[PDB]
Amino acid sequence: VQLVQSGAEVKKPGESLTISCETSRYNFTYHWVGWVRQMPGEGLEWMGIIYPGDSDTRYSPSFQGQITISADKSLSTTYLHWRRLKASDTAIYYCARLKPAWGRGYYFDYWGQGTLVTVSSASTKGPSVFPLAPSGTAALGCLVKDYFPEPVTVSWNSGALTSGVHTFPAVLQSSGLYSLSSVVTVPSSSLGTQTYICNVNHKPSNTKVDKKVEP
Amino acid sequence: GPIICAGPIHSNKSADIPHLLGYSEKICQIDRLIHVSSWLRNHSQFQGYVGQRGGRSQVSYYPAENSYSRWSGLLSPCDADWLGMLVVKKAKGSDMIVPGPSYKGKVFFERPTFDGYVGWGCGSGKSRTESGELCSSDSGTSSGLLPSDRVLWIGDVACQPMTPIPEETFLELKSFSQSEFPDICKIDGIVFNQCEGESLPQPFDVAWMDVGHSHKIIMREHKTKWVQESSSKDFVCYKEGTGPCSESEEKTCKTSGSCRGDMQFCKVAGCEHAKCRCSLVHKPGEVVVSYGGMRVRPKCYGFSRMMATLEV
Amino acid sequence: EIVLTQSPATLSVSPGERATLSCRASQSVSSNLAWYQHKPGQAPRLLIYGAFIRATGIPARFSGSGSGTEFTLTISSLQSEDFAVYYCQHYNNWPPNPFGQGTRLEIKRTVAAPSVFIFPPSDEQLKSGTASVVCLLNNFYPREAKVQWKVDNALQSGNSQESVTEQDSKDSTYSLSSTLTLSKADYEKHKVYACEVTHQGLSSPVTKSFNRG
Numbered sequence: 139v140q141l142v143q144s145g146a147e148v149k150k151p152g153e154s155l156t157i158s159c160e161t162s163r164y165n166f167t168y169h170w171v172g173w174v175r176q177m178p179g180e181g182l183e184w185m186g187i188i189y190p191g192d193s194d195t196r197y198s199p200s201f202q203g204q205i206t207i208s209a210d211k212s213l214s215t216t217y218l219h220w221r222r223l224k225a226s227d228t229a230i231y232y233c234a235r236l237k238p239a240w241g242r243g244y245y246f247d248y249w250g251q252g253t254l255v256t257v258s259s260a261s262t263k264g265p266s267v268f269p270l271a272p273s274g275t276a277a278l279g280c281l282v283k284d285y286f287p288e289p290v291t292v293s294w295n296s297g298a299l300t301s302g303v304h305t306f307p308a309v310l311q312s313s314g315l316y317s318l319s320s321v322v323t324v325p326s327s328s329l330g331t332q333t334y335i336c337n338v339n340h341k342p343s344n345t346k347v348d349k350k351v352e353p
Numbered sequence: 354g355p356i357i358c359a360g361p362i363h364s365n366k367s368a369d370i371p372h373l374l375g376y377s378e379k380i381c382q383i384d385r386l387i388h389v390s391s392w393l394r395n396h397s398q399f400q401g402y403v404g405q406r407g408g409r410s411q412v413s414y415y416p417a418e419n420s421y422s423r424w425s426g427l428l429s430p431c432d433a434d435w436l437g438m439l440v441v442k443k444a445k446g447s448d449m450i451v452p453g454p455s456y457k458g459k460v461f462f463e464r465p466t467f468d469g470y471v472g473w474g475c476g477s478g479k480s481r482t483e484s485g486e487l488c489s490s491d492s493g494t495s496s497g498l499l500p501s502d503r504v505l506w507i508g509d510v511a512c513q514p515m516t517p518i519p520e521e522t523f524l525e526l527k528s529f530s531q532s533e534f535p536d537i538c539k540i541d542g543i544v545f546n547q548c549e550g551e552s553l554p555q556p557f558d559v560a561w562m563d564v565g566h567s568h569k570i571i572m573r574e575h576k577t578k579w580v581q582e583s584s585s586k587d588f589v590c591y592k593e594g595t596g597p598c599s600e601s602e603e604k605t606c607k608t609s610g611s612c613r614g615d616m617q618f619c620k621v622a623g624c625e626h627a628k629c630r631c632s633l634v635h636k637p638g639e640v641v642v643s644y645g646g647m648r649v650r651p652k653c654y655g656f657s658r659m660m661a662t663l664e665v
Numbered sequence: 666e667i668v669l670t671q672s673p674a675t676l677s678v679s680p681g682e683r684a685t686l687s688c689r690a691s692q693s694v695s696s697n698l699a700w701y702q703h704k705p706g707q708a709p710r711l712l713i714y715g716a717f718i719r720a721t722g723i724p725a726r727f728s729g730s731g732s733g734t735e736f737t738l739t740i741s742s743l744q745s746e747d748f749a750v751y752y753c754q755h756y757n758n759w760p761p762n763p764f765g766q767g768t769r770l771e772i773k774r775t776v777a778a779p780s781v782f783i784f785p786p787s788d789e790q791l792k793s794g795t796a797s798v799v800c801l802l803n804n805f806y807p808r809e810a811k812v813q814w815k816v817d818n819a820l821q822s823g824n825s826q827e828s829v830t831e832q833d834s835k836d837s838t839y840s841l842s843s844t845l846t847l848s849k850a851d852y853e854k855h856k857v858y859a860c861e862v863t864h865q866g867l868s869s870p871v872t873k874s875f876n877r878g
């Protein structure tokens with residue numbers, strides 16, 4: 139049994155989106171499917187479920203009027219659709235297959251992989267990279283500031299420096315831009331001998347920056 | 354931005370301050386910093402107004418990083434004061450002034466306290482010293498029509514119609530909050546935990562909610578959700594170019610189904626497309642809090658600085 | 666209206682040991698309880714439905730038990746992939762929020778103190794209008810660490826953001842970074858920038874500071 143979802147989305151508030159869940163390896167017409175959202179750092183919320191057999195569609199009251207769940211038995215596929223996204227729509231969205239419990243509710247016996255939907259008025263912007271200078275073992279790193287959207291990937295000495303590295307989860311700033319640090323621990327000996335270069339990547343913006351970090 | 358009314362321009366510093374009746378009327382008052390103006394007149398022997406040219410959307414906040422003011426329609430503690438949901442008391446000599454805000458030159462500032470909401474005012478022709486200790490003579494206040502820069506609301510706070518909770522569940526909450534803050538002895542003058550060695554008071558930035566009881570519930574590990582309730586408080590009624598509508602004009606429009614509105618107003622109350630128009634206030638909704646195994650809709654929720662003493 | 670709390674919110678238990686997660690319901694739900702595991706950055710997986718019926722393809726070392734108001738997810742001996750967030754879910758009715766809040770399972774280890782570093786703003790950044798000051802807490806355990814910024818001895822509020830790594834695979838520690846953000850104007854108006862760190866593993870709070878220089 140496989141639920142395969144469409145890919146990631148970056149959209150502006152006020153916009154329309156349809157994201158799909160393709161089903162296979164079971165008869166799509168007599169199992170309930172539905173959609174669940176995980177808002178950043180929160181738990182699970184169900185949005186609404188649908189029975190593709192008779193098209194009985196039912197939504198959580200919180201999501202009523204905000205969205206459209208629909209099905210297409212020929213393609214064994216569910217659809218989730220907003221006609222107008224808000225920035226609070228930024229979340230991961232799962233389709234799943236439900237099992238009923240007669241008069242009662244349901245449980246979720248199979249889950250799609252997730253679709254990350256980001257909603258933001260920001261344009262794509264590459265990171266700016268500032269060094270964190272070290273001033274026994276010493277620490278040093280790179281500050282990666284004001285990019286959108288995620289992700290960025292940071293490496294050290296074109297991937298050769300792999301031990302003692304911490305690249306942190308980014309944060310959404312008040313400006314809408316993401317920001318994030320990568321640090322390394324290093325023996326004091328090596329500074330003034332060894333060269334330390336963090337390599338920052340931001341695929342969406344086609345930017346690559348290499349910054350040297352220094353005493 | 355503003356809810357209804359663009360920035361005030363007063364000229365009669367002694368002009369009457371009308372008690373209006375409409376929801377959308379006193380909302381427009383709130384918008385014009387007039388509720389804070391009335392506060393200074395009642396309590397601090399002040400002539401005039403604050404908010405000139407600026408209104409609410411130019412009030413200063415501490416910290417300056419304040420997110421709830423990016424939503425015009427969320428009520429600050431002063432605003433719930435003008436609508437009747439709480440009282441912003443006049444400061445006593447025991448009410449501790451918290452360090453951190455830029456106090457110099459403010460004429461009114463407000464902070465949430467552990468057991469209420471306290472405002473400190475200055476008289477006509479005076480403003481606050483840098484520390485915030487005193488009111489002293491200030492040349493730039495002589496006008497009596499002072500800018501929004503002279504109003505300071507301490508904290509990132511939102512206030513709303515609350516759903517009352519029983520005493521039993523309040524006690525039940527008070528104890529969890531004590532459990533997450535065990536090295537605290539008192540907050541803002543009120544006993545939090547029993548102590549021996551208690552230190553001197555110092556700044557304490559914390560998340561908290563007001564559940565309509567004898568003190569706030571301060572919180573460390575909690576969760577919040579927002580529910581767009583689109584009830585009658587969620588709409589303001591107005592006459593384009595001449596400001597809010599009257600109590601009459603508004604109440605007829607939330608009852609008749611006859612007047613103009615936006616997509617949500619027609620959907621819940623009734624459209625016909627002059628006359629008054631009503632629209633949704635820009636806010637993310639009513640906040641609901643999950644703390645220590647309970648789900649409550651508080652009266653106020655936010656992150657503010659208070660004074661607390663530690664164990665020794 | 667029927668509320669499910671999973672307590673503790675974080676259970677710290679050694680690998681190879683036995684893990685027992687609680688789910689308590691506010692009103693009886695009979696056996697209409699299910700349990701999910703949520704791996705880092707993957708889809709949830711169903712483990713138990715019916716409070717005790719193992720779902721298809723789930724290892725025996727997961728077992729469900731309870732009925733009514735108290736429910737337990739037990740893992741007989743914890744393996745590496747078993748450290749994840751675990752959710753309980755009822756289906757007595759179909760309310761808007763039938764899920765518990767989840768319990769995070771972490772690797773328990775011995776208390777370890779962070780190594781603290783503070784970095785002043787790069788010159789290159791300072792020329793563009795903003796100063797960002799970064800404090801680094803390196804390789805500590807437990808995760809509960811408290812970090813305060815003090816400029817010219819004045820506590821800060823509103824101008825910093827913490828980020829934590831996930832647990833190390835080798836030593837199972839955490840690292841945290843706090844970034845304090847100021848405009849060149851404000852940044853240049855002050856002299857001592859101090860990072861203050863409090864953690865179970867330190868006898869007394871640790872400060873690391875610099876003067877604008």
Ligand SMILES: *[C@@H]1O[C@H](CO)[C@@H](O[C@@H]2O[C@H](CO)[C@@H](O)[C@H](O)[C@H]2NC(C)=O)[C@H](O)[C@H]1NC(C)=O
Nearest residue numbers: 163164165166167168169190191192211212214
């Ligand atoms: C899935 O099951 C449904 C119903 O059990 C199937 O639909 C029936 O198909 C038979 C013959 O294939 C017809 O005689 C019925 O009239 C159909 N009923 C309905 C309501 O569609 C369907 O063919 C099955 N599909 C797959 C792919 O297995």
Ligand SMILES: *[C@@H]1O[C@H](CO)[C@@H](O)[C@H](O)[C@H]1NC(C)=O
Nearest residue numbers: 364365366367368369370371
């Ligand atoms: C305007 O000022 C005069 C004198 O100070 C006062 O009598 C009058 O009441 C004020 N305006 C109004 C509308 O009352």
Ligand SMILES: *[C@@H]1O[C@H](CO)[C@@H](O)[C@H](O)[C@H]1NC(C)=O
Nearest residue numbers: 372388389391392395434435
């Ligand atoms: C000031 O006093 C008047 C007179 O009762 C009252 O109507 C008004 O609400 C008061 N305003 C404030 C802010 O206390």
